[PDB]
C-alpha cells in the first residue's frame, strides 16, 4: 500500500530510534521484526522495477 | 535511479544487523556475568586446621581429645574438641 | 558491469567486518568470564551469642565457641588466644 | 516479568550476599532463589538469539 | 600493480580463511589489517572509472 | 607471550583454587600469581579493540 518513498522513511526513522541503544530488549527487538519486513518487502519491487526496463529497452519479441 | 536505491536499502540492512548484534552482545556479557559470580560461591568465613596442619573437611575425623587451631584474619585461636552433634 | 562489481566489494567488506566482530566478541566473554571467577575467590564458626565470629574482640578468654563444617557443627572453649 | 528487571533483581541478591550480612541459615534462602532467576534468564536468552538467527539467515 | 580482476580474488582467499575460525588473535588481526586495505583501494578504482564514462558519454 | 597461552594459566589456576585441596599457605601464593597475569592480559585484549574501531572509521 505505502508507496516506495514512505518505505525509505519508515525504515530510515526505525533505525535511527533504534541506535540510540535506549529501548527495552522485548520492544527493541520486537520492532527489529519490522525493519527486515521493509527491508526485504522493498528489495523485491526492486526487482521487479529492475526487470522491466531490461525487457522495455532491449529489443524483446 | 535505480540501482542507486537498491545500494540505499543494503548499506541501511546493515546497520540494522551491526546495531542489534551490539545490543544483544552487551546483555549477554552482562548477564553471563553475574551467573558466574552466583556460582562463584565456592563451599555453600573462618579456617579451621588440625595440630598437625592437616585440614579437616569431615567432621568424623575429629577425635575430641585434641586442641584444633582456627586461624581467622587477624590471627588464630586454639582450643579442645570435646562434644560433636552431627547433622 | 562497472555496478555489480561495487556491490560485491561492499557485501565481501561488510562480511569481514562482521566475522572478525563476533570472534572478538567472543573472546572478550571468556575472559570477562575467567576473570570474575578468579577475582570472587572453608569453615565457619560462631559465638554462643549468635554472632558471626569476625575479631578477636568478640572472644572471652575462657568461653565456649562451635563451628560447622559440612556435615555439622561441634563445640569447644578457647585455649590460648594469639592474635598477630 | 520482564527480563531487565530479571537481572536487577539477581545483581541486588548478588551484591548483598557478597556483603557477608545475612546469616548462613537465611543465607542459603536467597541463594535458592537466585538459581530461580538465574535459569529464567538463561531460557529467555536463548529464545532471543533464535529469532535473530532465523531471521537473519539466508533461509 | 594488481588488476581489479586478482584483488577480488585474493579478498575471497582472506575472507573465507578467516570464517574458518581456526585462527589465533595476532594472526587474525593481521589478516583483517591487510583485508580492509586491499578493500578500499579496489574502492577507489572502481570510483576512478566510473568518472571516466561520465566524461566520456557525456558530450564533454 | 601470546594471549592464548595468557588464558591457558589463567583458567589451570582457577580450577586449582575450586579443587580446595591446596591449604592456605600456597592458595594465597597462587593467587599474586593470578591477577598479574589478569592485568597484562586485559591490557592485550584492550589494544585489539582499538585496532578494529580505527580500521572500521572512515579512514
Same mark, same amino acid.
Given at each position: 500500500?505505502?508507496?516506495? @518513498?514512505? *518505505? #525509505?522513511? !519508515?525504515? $530510515?526513522?526505525? +533505525?535511527?530510534?533504534?541506535?540510540? =541503544?535506549?529501548?527495552? %530488549? @522485548?520492544? *527493541? #527487538?520486537? !520492532?527489529? $521484526?519490522?525493519? +527486515?519486513?521493509?527491508?526485504?518487502? =522493498?528489495?523485491?519491487? %526492486?526487482?521487479? *522495477?529492475?526487470?522491466?526496463?531490461?525487457?522495455?529497452?532491449?529489443?524483446?519479441? | 535511479?535505480?540501482?542507486?536505491?537498491?545500494?540505499?536499502?543494503?548499506?541501511?540492512?546493515?546497520?540494522?544487523?551491526?546495531?542489534?548484534?551490539?545490543?544483544?552482545?552487551?546483555?549477554?556479557?552482562?548477564?553471563?556475568?553475574?551467573?558466574?559470580?552466583?556460582?562463584?560461591?565456592?563451599?555453600?568465613?573462618?579456617?579451621?586446621?588440625?595440630?598437625?596442619?592437616?585440614?579437616?573437611?569431615?567432621?568424623?575425623?575429629?577425635?575430641?581429645?585434641?586442641?584444633?587451631?582456627?586461624?581467622?584474619?587477624?590471627?588464630?585461636?586454639?582450643?579442645?574438641?570435646?562434644?560433636?552433634?552431627?547433622?
Amino acid at each position: 500500500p505505502a508507496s516506495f @518513498e514512505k *518505505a #525509505l522513511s !519508515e525504515l $530510515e526513522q526505525i +533505525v535511527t530510534r533504534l541506535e540510540s =541503544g535506549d529501548l527495552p %530488549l @522485548e520492544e *527493541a #527487538l520486537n !520492532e527489529f $521484526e519490522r525493519g +527486515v519486513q521493509l527491508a526485504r518487502q =522493498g528489495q523485491a519491487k %526492486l526487482q521487479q *522495477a529492475e526487470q522491466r526496463v531490461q525487457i522495455l529497452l532491449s529489443d524483446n519479441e | 535511479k535505480i540501482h542507486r536505491a537498491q545500494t540505499r536499502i543494503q548499506q541501511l540492512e546493515y546497520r540494522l544487523a551491526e546495531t542489534l548484534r551490539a545490543q544483544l552482545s552487551a546483555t549477554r556479557e552482562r548477564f553471563g556475568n553475574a551467573v558466574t559470580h552466583l556460582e562463584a560461591v565456592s563451599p555453600l568465613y573462618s579456617v579451621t586446621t588440625a595440630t598437625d596442619g592437616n585440614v579437616l573437611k569431615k567432621v568424623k575425623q575429629v577425635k575430641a581429645g585434641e586442641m584444633l587451631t582456627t586461624r581467622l584474619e587477624d590471627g588464630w585461636i586454639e582450643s579442645e574438641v570435646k562434644n560433636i552433634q552431627p547433622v
